[PDB]
Design a protein around this ligand. Sequence first.
Ligand code: HEM
Ligand code: HEM
Ligand code: HEM
Ligand code: HEM
Ligand SMILES: [Zn+2]
Ligand SMILES: [Zn+2]
Ligand SMILES: [Zn+2]
Ligand SMILES: [Zn+2]
Ligand SMILES: [Zn+2]
Ligand SMILES: [Zn+2]
Ligand SMILES: [Zn+2]
Ligand SMILES: [Zn+2]
Ligand SMILES: [Zn+2]
Ligand SMILES: [Zn+2]
Ligand SMILES: [Zn+2]
Ligand SMILES: [Zn+2]
Ligand SMILES: [Zn+2]
Ligand SMILES: [Zn+2]
Lengths: 106, 106, 106, 106
Amino acid sequence: ADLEDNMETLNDNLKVIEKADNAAQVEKALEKMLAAAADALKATPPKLEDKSPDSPEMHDFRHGFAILMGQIHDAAHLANEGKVKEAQAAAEQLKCTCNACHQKYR
Amino acid sequence: ADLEDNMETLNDNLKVIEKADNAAQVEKALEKMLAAAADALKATPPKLEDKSPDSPEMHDFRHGFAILMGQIHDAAHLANEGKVKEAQAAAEQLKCTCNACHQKYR
Amino acid sequence: ADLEDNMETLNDNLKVIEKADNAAQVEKALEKMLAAAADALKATPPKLEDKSPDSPEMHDFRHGFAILMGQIHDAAHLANEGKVKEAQAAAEQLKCTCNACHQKYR
Amino acid sequence: ADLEDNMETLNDNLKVIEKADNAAQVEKALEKMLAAAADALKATPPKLEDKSPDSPEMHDFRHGFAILMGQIHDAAHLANEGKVKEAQAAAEQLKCTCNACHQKYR
Ligand code: HEM
Ligand code: HEM
Ligand code: HEM
Ligand code: HEM
Ligand SMILES: [Zn+2]
Ligand SMILES: [Zn+2]
Ligand SMILES: [Zn+2]
Ligand SMILES: [Zn+2]
Ligand SMILES: [Zn+2]
Ligand SMILES: [Zn+2]
Ligand SMILES: [Zn+2]
Ligand SMILES: [Zn+2]
Ligand SMILES: [Zn+2]
Ligand SMILES: [Zn+2]
Ligand SMILES: [Zn+2]
Ligand SMILES: [Zn+2]
Ligand SMILES: [Zn+2]
Ligand SMILES: [Zn+2]
């Protein structure tokens, strides 16, 4: 997928995570978000469409996804040990990373 | 140090990080926060003073610091590669972890 | 790319990292490995070609790359702060993760 | 505790993890190792007893424990989701970090 449709996947599964009932559902959504994030890693955002692959802006852009994946990874562990409530909270806490990247490059 | 004084160290160095000018200063403050966090790992918070070392609440309490240290660790790398602005932002993004723990156990 | 060619990229850049001279070269190789790893995340290995997307084997398979990317992510920070020698060592220490996965699913 | 007796705790619990039978036992040992590692964070190793708190050697020394804790943290999650065998393997995979630090500063 491309950046935008990777972003919609993150956003739609985050939504699924909010209104989830059991652990299994959070894990699946988390997994999908992890894949989306992985796929976004290699994209160039319009705001830096001019700028080169090797610019400090693109390194920092790629870094944001590094953070995001690590966060999803951990949240998924919480899902896998049955701890639904804290998984959902960890998912909520992702927004701090989403917004940080948007603010700079969106 | 004790829990409370560990907490004040985190809070005071976070404040130092906000109003910092160069990379070196952020790194030092970050380092101090990392130490404070490490020290807090083993404390029992008043709200769980009743509860045992092995309760799922104390595991989740200890887990919060595991998150926090990892976050500081990464933010410090940013400080060490001269990237002041993004280090400061990563420091701000810690607040999501602070508040998450306060909410449950403070 | 496909799994095999993703694997050769990891292996060839690891080799580049061994015999590197400056920081910039390690960072580039590390970046490439990170991308390769991200790409591998979604593959099904022949040994589990029978088994479903949702099997505990495929979860543990995906988990191995989650580890690997996090490790590359940190090693790259070391590359970015000029610390060549320790970056190279962190790269060598990846082999423990490579071999762990091979052992089970290769 | 001091460095040496922190090191014996890591080593004795690693031993406990090898010869463990159930998940609960691995988790406890892992927890103890996490605490030991946290406690070691602030020590000065004899080989750098001369050198200052702020030397690049002491930063790299402290970094090694950052890596180690993150690794234990993840291994403990595996313990907490009942996956004994892979927890034990993750514990084994710690040795790559132990040895890396010994080699440079022991
Ligand atoms: C769970 C985390 C996140 C969610 C839910 C999320 C959600 C979204 C949504 C809904 C959009 C609008 C897409 C459009 O322009 O049509 C978007 C755009 C974007 N996001 Fe995210 N996002 C997340 C994380 C991130 C991160 C970590 C980065 C960068 C490191 C990032 C960079 C962007 C960029 C650059 C755009 C603009 C895409 C474009 O217009 O071409 N986002 N995001
Ligand atoms: C940058 C991160 C954090 C900051 C700035 C912070 C700050 C503080 C502050 C200012 C207090 C109140 C001090 C007082 O007047 O007594 C406090 C209390 C507390 N914090 Fe944090 N905190 C952070 C992270 C955490 C985390 C991760 C946890 C748990 C995992 C935690 C658990 C607590 C608890 C339990 C108290 C209550 C202590 C008491 O009542 O004596 N905090 N924190
Ligand atoms: C630096 C890290 C790694 C390196 C250098 C590496 C290297 C390789 C190499 C050289 C091959 C054989 C290529 C061929 O002749 O077909 C291979 C195959 C494989 N690797 Fe890795 N690998 C790494 C990490 C991983 C990880 C983390 C996993 C799983 C989570 C994994 C799973 C596999 C599998 C399943 C195969 C078999 C592919 C096939 O038979 O087509 N590897 N790897
Ligand atoms: C699970 C991981 C590890 C185990 C099992 C382990 C085990 C040990 C043991 C058994 C000793 C001998 C203590 C003595 O001198 O009497 C030791 C020493 C030492 N270890 Fe570790 N170690 C680990 C990780 C680390 C790490 C990550 C570092 C540094 C980043 C480190 C630094 C040292 C140092 C500096 C000494 C020498 C202490 C001294 O002589 O004053 N070790 N370790
Ligand atoms: Zn795509
Ligand atoms: Zn949608
Ligand atoms: Zn799943
Ligand atoms: Zn965790
Ligand atoms: Zn204390
Ligand atoms: Zn420093
Ligand atoms: Zn980072
Ligand atoms: Zn591909
Ligand atoms: Zn680069
Ligand atoms: Zn690091
Ligand atoms: Zn001590
Ligand atoms: Zn002993
Ligand atoms: Zn326990
Ligand atoms: Zn994990």
